Structure formats: structure tokens, C-alpha cells
Amino acid sequence: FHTVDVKGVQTRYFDDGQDKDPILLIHGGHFGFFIPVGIESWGNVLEDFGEYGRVLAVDKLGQGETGLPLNDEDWTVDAVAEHVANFATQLGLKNLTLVGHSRGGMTAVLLALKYPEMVKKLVIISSATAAPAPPVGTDMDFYERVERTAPGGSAELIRHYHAAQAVNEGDLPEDYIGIATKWLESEKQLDAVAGYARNAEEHWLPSLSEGRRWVQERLADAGIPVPTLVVWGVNNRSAPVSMGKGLFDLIAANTLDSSLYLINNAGHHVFSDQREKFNAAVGAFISL
Amino acid sequence: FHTVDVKGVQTRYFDDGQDKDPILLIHGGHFGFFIPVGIESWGNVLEDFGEYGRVLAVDKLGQGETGLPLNDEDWTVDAVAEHVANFATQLGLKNLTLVGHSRGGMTAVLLALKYPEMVKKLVIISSATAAPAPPVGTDMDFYERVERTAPGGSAELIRHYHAAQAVNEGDLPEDYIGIATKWLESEKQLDAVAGYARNAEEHWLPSLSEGRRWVQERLADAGIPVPTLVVWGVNNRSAPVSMGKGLFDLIAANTLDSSLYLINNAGHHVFSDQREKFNAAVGAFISL
Ligand SMILES: */O=C(\[O])C1=[C][C]=[C][C]=C1C([O])=O
Ligand SMILES: */O=C(\[O])C1=[C][C]=[C][C]=C1C([O])=O
């Protein structure tokens, strides 16, 4: 692990130190999310992607051990993406491969769209955020449901969420439960929830909708400027496969160098649920 | 190459001879098909899958350089599958990975269903045959049209068909053209087409419908007993991606260990159209 200052924000990141083309991992979730998500959430892939390249994972704005956004105006999708981009510029990353999950996928997409010179490959995993908004309800309804039904307890909450989305499940690693718990009791987490509740309607959600609209625009125009791989779990409970397929149709419309991989007996956490196939497929995509 | 006798049928096959897990390639087409399909149709894949295992390719019944079925009763999908099974048994293939394309895909399924002891992994590529029958028309309508509009000439026919199906391909290799021309003009081809016209309605087509109904039954029952990969080209013209997806949905119902890979800018011959991606993905899948 390491810590650095990115445009006035204290950012924690992970670096493989290998001398290969870099792979940047952008995790899911957003600031103030009822579940803490961090570098450790990548779990085994941090080691597993060692063969395919120099692995880097970064804590997003206002998540993990990274600082909250400097201003309320920065509670936007674009601020997050720009934070990751500035982080990459700071580390002199080139020939980059972006692997994003959930909300991170959205981040990754934007970067690919906004900075093709830096990015060579893009991987989107189970990202309802990058995809068009659901026809009814919100992308948060599943999560609101899971939060409201959660039993008291910090670890109990995390296990509750894992039970909510795991399909090919086993108990979470104890270390991760400990770290995620530590994140959960943290004052920054409280501040994150407060910031979300404060800035969701004014800043975050509009940036989300406008972001989806922009991504859809680019997909209908020239598509993504880099080779794209979409990974999804057939049994994903938060985000249905249908929107994953639809997102693939939108990408495939004008992005010739693109592919879709659907894994059965997997949920939102495909890399966790079906680790070996995920590594085999995504790894195959990265090493070509 | 080599020739061996499989239940009284002269059978041509290719074996790289490596001491690795076997990969059996079953090519497309059926006996009497207006285009000859053989081991050579696999082209680069024959060398390319050398990395992933011991490659074997076999000419199907009444196809390539193998003899026509001995009896009119043997013009069935099950007879073809039985020929391939018998062939694999004679050479002592175990831990087999079945990779079937188009009609071969159907064969690949049957064996997987019928001989789990022999088969360890399954790959289906662009198989309208394995998929359910079309809601309107037949799986041959596309081909009947391609046949009827073809200009005179053997090479002219083969390039006509290639133009009909190619998406990211360039003019065919001359090496393949000579072989395909010789196959087309050969007396055996004439005998195969005549035999097809003779046995299509009574034996072959009922065997096809019954095969589809049976496969669907097994898929809805216990599914396939081996890890399965379904590969498809998004721009497939003979067999639309929708029916491919439908087939994957049918498989995924009870086959936990299954995946679907959709490749953009590829058609029926995915392995030709997107060679590097295809080799990467399928090769990664075969090696786990
Ligand atoms: O985990 C996520 O990335 C996420 C959070 C909230 C809504 C949707 C999503 C998603 O993209 O799966
Ligand atoms: O690929 C084939 O061999 C084929 C030929 C004729 C109709 C359908 C198919 C198929 O399964 O795609």
C-alpha cells in the first residue's frame, strides 16, 4: 500500500511494482454507500491479475482510506473519474488497462471515453451504473432493500450484504470482514453518508443521469475507443443480466473491438463467485 | 493425416500427436451439404489450438474424405454422433474437450450428454443446429438462398458462400480453395448430395427435430454434465445471435459451469473472423 496527494485529496493505492503494462482496478460503490468498498474488496484478483500485468488498485473518492471530496460540488461521477485519471497521470501510467466493477465500471468507461491516449483496454464488470438506468425504480432499490432488512451489527451488516448478492457463496475472509468493519465504524464513513444525503439530489444523481446519457451518446457515435470486454454474472441480483446484455448491444453498435462474457452460477461479484473462469477469460482479454 | 476404419467407414482424421489432453474438433455441415466441409475448414485453428492441448480433427460421416454412411438408416444426427464417439473410443481419447461448430456443435452436445466419462469440457461455436429450430423457416433457408444465387464455378461457389458469411474476413487462402474445389467436383460429393436428397425427409430431418427436442429435454432436466462454453459472433448471418443466446439460456438453466462469449465483428466462422480473440478466450477456457 501507498498514500499520495491527488489534487488535494489523500489517496490510498496498491501497486504490484511489476514491470508490465499496468492494470487499474476501480472498485464498486460510491461515497456514503451503506457498504464500505475498498482495495481489499478486490480480494484475490489483486494477486490473480499479477500474471496478466502490473496490478494497481485505487480507493475511489470518499471511499476506503481515501479522503472525502474537497467540495460538495465534487460529489459527482465525473469528479470520481477525474480523481482516478489524475491519479494515473500522477503515477505516469501508460498502456493502461481499466477494470471497473459496478460504479467503478462507470468510472472506467468515462476514462476510456475521455482519455483514449492513456487507456489501451477497458473491462466492465456487472456495472449497472455504466448501463442505462433501469426502466422502473432505481439502481439503489436492491441496496435500499438490503439495508433496511439488515440486522443490527457492523459485521452482521456486511455478512447480510454478502448473503444478499453471493450466488456461488462461501464465508467472507475474516481479514476483509475486519477491514470493512473498521471502515464502517469510521467517522469518515459517517461523514460520507452525511455528504451523500446532503448532495445526492443536487449533485450526485444528476451527474449520474447525465453521465449515462453521455455514455449512451458516445456509444451511438463512435463507440469506445479501446478494446472492450463486458463481464456479467447470469444470476446477478442487484443488476439484471438483461441490462448487461443491452449495454453490450449499445457498445457493440459502434465498438468493433468488443466482446461479452456471461458466466453462469455467478452474481454481482463474478470474480469472487466464479474466480477461475473470471481470471481465465479476463486474463485472456488482457494478454493479447 | 491418417485414415482408420470406424465401424466399416473409412475415416480421415488429423492428430498433432502431442502428449496432452485431447481436443476434438467437429466441423460444420452435413452429408450432402452444398459446400464441402472438412478438417481443412478448421484452417489455422488446427495449428493454433496446439498451445492448449493435443488437437484432433475428424472428418464427419459423408463429409471430407470419410466414406458415406453405410445405410440409408444412418443418415441421422445420432449416426454421425455415434461415428464420432466410436472414433474417439478407438483412439482411446479420455479427458476430451469437444469443440463443435455449426452442425458439429450439435454432435458435440450429444456426445457430451451421452458420454460424460469420455468428455471433460465442451465448446459450442455458432451452432444453429444445437439451438432450437427457428420460429419461421428452417436452418437451411439461408443456405438454400446462397445456393440458388451462386454463379457457376466451383471456386466461384466457395467464394460466393464466403462472401455471404464473412464479416471480418478477406479473400480465402488459396490452399483452402484448391482442396475445397477438389472436394466439390469429386464423385463422393455428388453421391453425398444425391444421398441427401434421397434420405432427407425420411431419415435426416426427423433425426434433426428429434435431436433438438431431446437436447432441449436434457437441458431442461439435468443440463450438460461438463463445463460448457458457447461462442458466438454477433454478426452471424446464417444463425442469429438471438437464437444463440436462447441456446445459452436453455443450457444455463441447469448447467452451473457454463459461459457464453459473444464476439463483435464476427460471423458464423468466428475462429476465422476474430482469430486472436477466439484463440485467447477458448484457449483460456480449455486450460482450467
Ligand atoms: O456496486 C455497484 O457498482 C452499484 C452500486 C449501486 C447501484 C448500482 C451498482 C452497479 O453498477 O452494480
Ligand atoms: O454450421 C452448420 O453446420 C449449419 C449448417 C446448416 C444449418 C445450420 C447450421 C448451424 O448449426 O449453424
Numbering used by the authors:
A (entry chain D), B (entry chain A): 24 to 311
What does the paper say about this structure?
MehpH is a monoalkyl phthalate hydrolases discovered from Gordonia sp. Here we report the structures of MehpH, a monoalkyl phthalate (MBP) hydrolase that catalyzes the reaction of MBP to phthalic acid and the corresponding alcohol, in apo and ligand-bound form. The structure of MehpH, determined at a resolution of 2.3 Å, exhibits the typical fold of the α/β hydrolase superfamily and is composed of an α/β hydrolase core (residues 24-152 and 225-311) and an α-helical lid domain (residues 153-224). The catalytic triad, composed of Ser125, Asp259 and His291 with His291 bridging Asp259 and Ser125 through hydrogen bonds, is situated at the bottle-neck of the tunnel, suggesting this tunnel may be involved in the hydrolysis process of MehpH.
A catalytically inactive nucleophile mutation D259N was introduced in the active site to capture the transition state of MehpH-MBP interaction, and the subsequent structure was finally determined at a resolution of 2.8 Å. Structure superposition of the apo and ligand-bound MehpH revealed no significant conformational change on the whole structure of MehpH, except for the stabilization of the NC-loop in the lid domain and formation of a narrow hole extending from the protein surface to the catalytic Ser125. Surprisingly, instead of a separate electron density for MBP in the catalytic center, we observed extra electron density on the side chain of Ser125, indicative of an intermediate trapped in the structure. Additionally, adjacent to the catalytic center, we discovered the electron density of butanol in the penetrating tunnel. It appears that the butanol is highly dynamic in the structure, as only one butanol molecule with intact electron density in the four MehpH of a single asymmetric unit. Particularly, Arg126 and Asp162 construct a gate to lock PA in the pocket through two hydrogen bonds formed by their side chains. Of note, the location of the butanol is very close to His291 of the triad, leaving no space for a water molecule to attach the Ser125-PA intermediate.
